[PDB]
Amino acid sequence: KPKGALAVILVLTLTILVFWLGVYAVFFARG
Amino acid sequence: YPEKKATLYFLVLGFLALIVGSLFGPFQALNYGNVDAYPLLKRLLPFVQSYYQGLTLHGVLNAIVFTQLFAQAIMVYLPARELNMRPNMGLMWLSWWMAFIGLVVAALPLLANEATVLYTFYPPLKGHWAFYLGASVFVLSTWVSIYIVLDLWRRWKAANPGKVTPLVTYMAVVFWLMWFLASLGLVLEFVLFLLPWSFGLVEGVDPLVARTLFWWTGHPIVYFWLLPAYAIIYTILPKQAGGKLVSDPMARLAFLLFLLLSTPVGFHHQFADPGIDPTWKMIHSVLTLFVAVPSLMTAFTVAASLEFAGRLRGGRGLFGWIRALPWDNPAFVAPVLGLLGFIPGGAGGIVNASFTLDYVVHNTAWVPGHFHLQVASLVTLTAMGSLYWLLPNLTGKPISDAQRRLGLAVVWLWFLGMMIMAVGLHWAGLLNVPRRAYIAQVPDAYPHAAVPMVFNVLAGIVLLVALLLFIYGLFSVLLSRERKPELAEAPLPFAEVISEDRRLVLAMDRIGFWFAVAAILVVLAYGPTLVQLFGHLNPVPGWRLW
Amino acid sequence: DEHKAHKAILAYEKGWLAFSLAMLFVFIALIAYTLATHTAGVIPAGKLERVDPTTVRQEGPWADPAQAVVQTGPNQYTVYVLAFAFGYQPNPIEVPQGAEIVFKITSPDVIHGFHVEGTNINVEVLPGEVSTVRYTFKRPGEYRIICNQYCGLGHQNMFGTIVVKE
Ligand code: HAS
Ligand code: HEM
Ligand SMILES: CCCCCCCC/C=C/CCCCCCCC(=O)OC[C@H](O)CO
Ligand SMILES: CCCCCCCC/C=C\CCCCCCCC(=O)OC[C@H](O)CO
Ligand SMILES: CCCCCCCC/C=C\CCCCCCCC(=O)OC[C@H](O)CO
Ligand SMILES: CCCCCCCC/C=C\CCCCCCCC(=O)OC[C@H](O)CO
Ligand SMILES: CCCCCCCC/C=C\CCCCCCCC(=O)OC[C@H](O)CO
Ligand SMILES: CCCCCCCC/C=C\CCCCCCCC(=O)OC[C@H](O)CO
Numbered sequence A: 001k002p003k004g005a006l007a008v009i010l011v012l013t014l015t016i017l018v019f020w021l022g023v024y025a026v027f028f029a030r031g
Numbered sequence B: 001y002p003e004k005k006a007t008l009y010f011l012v013l014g015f016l017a018l019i020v021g022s023l024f025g026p027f028q029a030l031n032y033g034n035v036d037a038y039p040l041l042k043r044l045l046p047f048v049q050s051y052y053q054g055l056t057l058h059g060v061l062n063a064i065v066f067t068q069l070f071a072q073a074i075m076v077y078l079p080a081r082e083l084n085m086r087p088n089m090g091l092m093w094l095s096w097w098m099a100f101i102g103l104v105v106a107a108l109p110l111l112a113n114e115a116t117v118l119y120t121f122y123p124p125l126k127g128h129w130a131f132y133l134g135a136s137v138f139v140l141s142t143w144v145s146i147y148i149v150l151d152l153w154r155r156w157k158a159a160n161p162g163k164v165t166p167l168v169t170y171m172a173v174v175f176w177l178m179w180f181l182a183s184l185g186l187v188l189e190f191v192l193f194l195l196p197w198s199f200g201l202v203e204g205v206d207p208l209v210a211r212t213l214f215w216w217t218g219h220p221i222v223y224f225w226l227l228p229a230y231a232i233i234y235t236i237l238p239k240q241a242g243g244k245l246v247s248d249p250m251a252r253l254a255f256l257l258f259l260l261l262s263t264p265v266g267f268h269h270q271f272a273d274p275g276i277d278p279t280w281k282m283i284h285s286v287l288t289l290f291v292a293v294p295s296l297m298t299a300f301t302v303a304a305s306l307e308f309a310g311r312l313r314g315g316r317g318l319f320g321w322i323r324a325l326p327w328d329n330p331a332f333v334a335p336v337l338g339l340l341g342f343i344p345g346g347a348g349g350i351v352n353a354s355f356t357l358d359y360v361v362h363n364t365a366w367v368p369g370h371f372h373l374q375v376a377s378l379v380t381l382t383a384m385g386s387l388y389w390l391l392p393n394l395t396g397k398p399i400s401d402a403q404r405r406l407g408l409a410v411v412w413l414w415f416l417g418m419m420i421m422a423v424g425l426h427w428a429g430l431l432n433v434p435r436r437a438y439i440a441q442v443p444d445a446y447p448h449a450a451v452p453m454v455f456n457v458l459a460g461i462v463l464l465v466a467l468l469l470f471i472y473g474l475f476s477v478l479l480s481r482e483r484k485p486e487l488a489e490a491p492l493p494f495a496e497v498i499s500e501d502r503r504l505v506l507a508m509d510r511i512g513f514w515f516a517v518a519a520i521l522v523v524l525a526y527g528p529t530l531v532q533l534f535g536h537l538n539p540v541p542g543w544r545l546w
Numbered sequence C: 001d002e003h004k005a006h007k008a009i010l011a012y013e014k015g016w017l018a019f020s021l022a023m024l025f026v027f028i029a030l031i032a033y034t035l036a037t038h039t040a041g042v043i044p045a046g047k048l049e050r051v052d053p054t055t056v057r058q059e060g061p062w063a064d065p066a067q068a069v070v071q072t073g074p075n076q077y078t079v080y081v082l083a084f085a086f087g088y089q090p091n092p093i094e095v096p097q098g099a100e101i102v103f104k105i106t107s108p109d110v111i112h113g114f115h116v117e118g119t120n121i122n123v124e125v126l127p128g129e130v131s132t133v134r135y136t137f138k139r140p141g142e143y144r145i146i147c148n149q150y151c152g153l154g155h156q157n158m159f160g161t162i163v164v165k166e
């Protein structure tokens, strides 16, 4: 299994999600 | 090999544009850190009248001129060298000259404070006709490039009936056809509107139509910036890393998606514009999320290939492959670091695309935070790395150990400055600091931003040093006396491909068809809205407010 | 080895591509949600509403900033904002808390931003066009309007105020 490639797409997924759910929170807080 | 000389001319002119464009960035970083260094800059560069003139130059020279010259260098030369065929030289030199000429023409009013619009030059803000004219000529240079590469591909296909297009040439064909569709928005906006208006021929321009036409090009132009770096990242970097590209088909699929999805999306720059129906904003929003796919895809293909290389080179465990990679080679380091910063870059872009979430970040410092990660860091760093393999190939000039070490410093400093700046800009942007603002001249206006403002000051000083080291570096390699013809004669370090199911590759090679589809999508996504707007034009007078 | 590296990398890639798709789709669902709620009020009206930027200060609802706030429903107010080089009229804009407010903003000169600090209101303002956006202020007090679209040298100091009364 390409374990490194998986870690990279882990970090990328986490990053997307912290960014997206983060901004979604801010959206509703300002709504 | 007269294509080497023309390629060289594109790369060097690009790099000159990037250097001059970049002079203004530390000043702008300092400004987003509440520090006014403009008086110093106007001592050194007395023709500069305002922060905004600086900002136009920076935008135009870095994001338009450099990126284009790079694209034109890379996506002509590489396919030519993979096919082992000579580009039409009279055409190649023609494109360089259009590029140089349109650059000199747009430069004159820019340097003389007659076009302090931005790089978006939004009507009714009205610049000097020479700005529009020269920018036009500069960008049409690319239609010649498209021709050049279409020719090469047909000459090849003819000589090799029944074969699939080789990888790099496949990349370049789909890339240039994408860019041709994409560019029609701006050529439309320019020809029907900006030019006549700047010439005095019509009184006003409809700002909404101007913006809609603009952003037709304004999105896919950033994929036009990226894809040259991707071609490198895909077909070259796996060799430099010590491995191979893990899949030719996955690399074609990514590029094919860019062809299909790069252009029908521009309303994502217009989530805050009046007069555009929300249902269309949602359609574009979805289409924008889809265009994130070839990069999600790229993330995995490229990550697996670097891991592969690292495993070949002896690394083991979950991080050993990282450690095992050639971190002493700036040509490997520069794109890889760019890729790392592309993770938060693309996360921010996915935020910008969600229709409603854009109201949080739109026109704030968030957006420069997103894009410096994408273009000022990944594309630029990848171009910077090509110094260390592309240049020797083009010139026979050797890279000394000293120069290799300096290159490592530039590439890490440049990367680090861009990460630090990215934190300062995202965060300031979340605090509501506007982009495109001489905010240091209102020092008491953004008190809640004091913390990310420290990051911008730092970033500005780190990127000043990175840039000064780049200039000394770039000129060391260009100005050195020696020429060893074994560097000039050596092959481009094209990767080998681990192998490919042919079904998929054949389908993807029906380029005429995919091109037609891409063209239909643009009609479906832009037709209805442009027909309504063109039916209801409200042209308005122009203004100089500088 | 390459034989084994090849199909294994591709097999996991297929998984990754499916997951990432699912995540994209989830965001689409979550966006569509926002679209069904009061928070979507801030999306501009899609409809073209054309005006003449050259006479907008002389006649029509932007001509008299002190009557710009018009009650248009039992709990609704329409506000005619002018965003111009380099300010906003009226100043301040004064509105009751808890009322739905329909901002109808235009420009007599060049494009301006209309960014209401602390809210989702963030709309480009185009000369010749009226931008229409909707918001309810839940909290009383003072909200700064920011211009976030470069409009010339007066840009960095173009600010406005909205006061929301208890
Ligand atoms: C080259 C330049 C650009 C790229 C590429 C780019 C990508 C995106 N952007 Fe963007 N952005 C747009 C949203 C997106 C989306 C959804 C993507 C996507 O294509 C992103 C997909 C990318 C990913 C999902 C990342 C994949 C990660 C990879 C591939 C890294 C893997 C790492 C490895 C393999 C390392 C491993 C190695 C080890 C050693 C570990 C939107 C809105 O929807 C706006 C308007 C916002 C507003 O309100 O104005 C915005 C505005 C801009 C502007 C401002 C224009 C202006 O001046 O007004 C610029 C210049 C720009 C450029 C760039 N943009 N963008
Ligand atoms: C020394 C490196 C650099 C620094 C310190 C820097 C800094 C900055 C800052 C702080 C801004 C925001 C200014 C504002 O919004 O008012 C900005 C804007 C911008 N930068 Fe950079 N930059 C650098 C290099 C680059 C490069 C390499 C590119 C692209 C290749 C680039 C493209 C842009 C663009 C397109 C804008 C937006 C201009 C506009 O909104 O009209 N920058 N830069
Ligand atoms: C290779 C080079 C990489 C670059 C690394 C450089 C790091 C920056 C220096 C930090 C030392 C701290 C110095 C801070 C002291 C001066 C602060 C200051 O007084 O600023 C002006 C004042 O705030 C206006 O009122
Ligand atoms: C190597 C690069 C790989 C990519 C990895 C880097 C990506 C950065 C991810 C998250 C930063 C978020 C930091 C923490 C989030 C802050 C949330 C928060 O504190 O909210 C404010 C609250 O109101 C209290 O004041
Ligand atoms: C590595 C270089 C790249 C730099 C990476 C950029 C940093 C931005 C990070 C995260 C965005 C997440 C959004 C932050 C979410 C915090 C706010 C929040 O949680 O909102 C609730 C609160 O009630 C509201 O007022
Ligand atoms: C606030 C943000 C500013 C901080 C910026 C942090 C962002 C991540 C930085 C570096 C990640 C690089 C990870 C990979 C480094 C690899 C080098 C290595 O592993 O060494 C092998 C050795 O050098 C034999 O050649
Ligand atoms: C090897 C050398 C690496 C060392 C580099 C340091 C790394 C991170 C620390 C400090 C950055 C400080 C730079 C900030 C300069 C002054 C910031 C400022 O202007 O602060 C004003 C204050 O918050 C209101 O008056
Ligand atoms: C709460 C939200 C969840 C966030 C948590 C992060 C999710 C992990 C992300 C991506 C993994 C994508 C890889 C999917 C693995 C697919 C399995 C597969 O393809 O297996 C074939 C192989 O032959 C085996 O036997």
Ligand SMILES: CCCCCCCC/C=C\CCCCCCCC(=O)OC[C@H](O)CO
Pocket (backbone or CB within 6 Å): A028, C026, C029, C030, C033, C037
């Ligand atoms: C294998 C698992 C299959 C299961 C797949 C499920 C995917 C789960 C994700 C998101 C659901 C979206 C929830 C939508 C509800 C939105 C509510 C909200 O966000 O509240 C905002 C505000 O307070 C009110 O005005």
Ligand SMILES: CCCCCCCC/C=C\CCCCCCCC(=O)OC[C@H](O)CO
Pocket (backbone or CB within 6 Å): A026, A029, A030, B423, B426, B427, B430, B431, C117, C118, C119, C139, C140, C141, C142, C143, C144
């Ligand atoms: C590494 C990157 C880290 C990122 C760091 C995250 C910081 C974001 C903070 C807040 C956003 C939330 C917005 C909430 C705005 C509400 C404030 C408000 O309501 O104030 C104005 C009002 O007029 C009073 O009467």
Ligand code: CUA
Pocket (backbone or CB within 6 Å): C084, C086, C111, C112, C113, C147, C148, C149, C150, C151, C152, C154, C155, C156, C158
């Ligand atoms: Cu009005 Cu910036």
Ligand SMILES: [Cu+2]
Pocket (backbone or CB within 6 Å): B218, B219, B220, B222, B266, B268, B269
């Ligand atoms: Cu875009």
